[PDB]
Amino acid sequence: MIVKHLEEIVDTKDDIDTTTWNSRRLLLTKDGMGFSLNDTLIKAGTETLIWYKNHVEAVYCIEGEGEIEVVGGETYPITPGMMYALDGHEKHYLRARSQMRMVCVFNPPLTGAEVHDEEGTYPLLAPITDNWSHPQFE
Numbered sequence: 001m002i003v004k005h006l007e008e009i010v011d012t013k014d015d016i017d018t019t020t021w022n023s024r025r026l027l028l029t030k031d032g033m034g035f036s037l038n039d040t041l042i043k044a045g046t047e048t049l050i051w052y053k054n055h056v057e058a059v060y061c062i063e064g065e066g067e068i069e070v071v072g073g074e075t076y077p078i079t080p081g082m083m084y085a086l087d088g089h090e091k092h093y094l095r096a097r098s099q100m101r102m103v104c105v106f107n108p109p110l111t112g113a114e115v116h117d118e119e120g121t122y123p124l125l126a127p128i129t130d131n132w133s134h135p136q137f138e
């Protein structure tokens with residue numbers, strides 16, 4: 001039996017932060033379920049190109065608005081309750097207008113290595129700057 005909680009996973013090694021998303025890993029390869037499961041926040045304003053050549057992924061949007069454009073296919077608006085699945089290993093752009101909370105399922109499981117690698121993703125547009133700077137720490 002396995003029990004976890006999002007509020008324990010955030011700000012933790014299972015919460016992987018990138019320029020365009022924040023991925024809270026719920027079931028890992030270690031957990032041995034046959035799939036990985038996470039809760040990903042795609043940040044407002046971002047664009048990411050995505051292509052998983054070695055996995056199929058299901059995505060279920062429970063918050064926010066955006067779209068997914070399939071390279072060589074259609075463009076599908078994302079809203080709460082929309083779900084898409086890349087059974088065809090589709091190359092695609094993922095765009096968030098507001099922050100999107102996505103529940104995600106990978107088959108086979110992603111590994112910590114692939115997540116940290118950012119295997120299959122290419123972030124193209126980051127969120128707008130909050131006036132921050134690396135050499136500024138005031």
Ligand SMILES: CC1=N[C@H](C(=O)O)CCN1
Binds near residue numbers: 040094115
């Ligand atoms: C569609 C997507 N999957 C990744 C994941 O759930 O690991 C998060 C970033 N975006």
Ligand SMILES: [Fe+3]
Binds near residue numbers: 050057059094
């Ligand atoms: Fe995706």
